[PDB]
Amino acid sequence: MLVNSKEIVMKELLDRYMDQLHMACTCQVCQNDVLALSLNKVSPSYVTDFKKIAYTKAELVDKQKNTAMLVILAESAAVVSESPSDLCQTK
Amino acid sequence: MLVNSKEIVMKELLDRYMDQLHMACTCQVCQNDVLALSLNKVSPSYVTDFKKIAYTKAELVDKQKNTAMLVILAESAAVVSESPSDLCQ
Ligand SMILES: [Zn+2]
Ligand SMILES: [Zn+2]
């Protein structure tokens, strides 16, 4: 299967560090918006071997690399918090 | 709900030019390699609404832009052909 390994990384960081990103709404819509803003800000890393995504995801341990990504998510989270899409929860 | 629109463009362009790229193997595995190498050389364009990906397939039918992307396809095609993944055959 054809998949950008950065999307796997983000989705993982987003789920693990959801609370420290301080989102106004946590519905799937708002979450997808954060992901999209963030994935459009990192260089694509498409692969075809699931074993290869495992290697990438492992390289971004709790120590070292993940912080730069958490910062982009947080930043994107701010934007979605203030300017939510019309497809989000309403009333 | 979460797709890179470039992915929708490259797939549509590949299955319109695949038989012109002089690819060594044309199995799904090598096709994925081509798409992956190509997707990695263009800027991501992630979307969340379904209304964009539908019309995105129409404004890619327009040219000049896809020409730049065709080149990419072809350049990706040469690499995959020259060095096929061991998941192919
Ligand atoms: Zn929401
Ligand atoms: Zn092949």
Residue numbers in the entry:
A (entry chain A): 1 to 91
B (entry chain B): 1 to 89
Quoted from the paper:
The comF operon encodes three proteins: ComFA, a DNA helicase and two proteins of unknown function, ComFB and ComFC. In the present study, we characterized the late competence protein ComFB from B. subtilis in vitro and in vivo. We find that ComFB is an obligate dimer with a dimerization interface highly conserved across a variety of bacterial species. ComFB tightly binds one zinc ion per subunit using an unusually-spaced four-cysteine motif.
The four molecules are arranged as two dimers, each with two-fold symmetry. The structure of ComFB consists of four α-helices, H1–4 and a six-residue extended β-strand-like loop between helices H2 and H3. We observed an anomalous difference density peak at the position of the hypothesized Zn2+ ion in each of the four molecules within the asymmetric unit. In ComFB, the Zn2+ ion is coordinated in a typical tetrahedral arrangement by four cysteine residues. Three of the cysteine ligands, C25, C27 and C30, are closely spaced in the primary sequence. In ComFB the fourth cysteine that completes the binding site comes from the C-terminal tail, residue C88. In the ComFB crystal structure, the C-terminal residues beyond C88 are largely disordered, suggesting that C88 binding to the Zn2+ ion helps lock helix H4 into place. One type generates homodimers of chains A and B and C and D respectively, within the asymmetric unit, burying a total of 1550 Å2 of surface area (for the A–B dimer), with 11 hydrogen bonds.
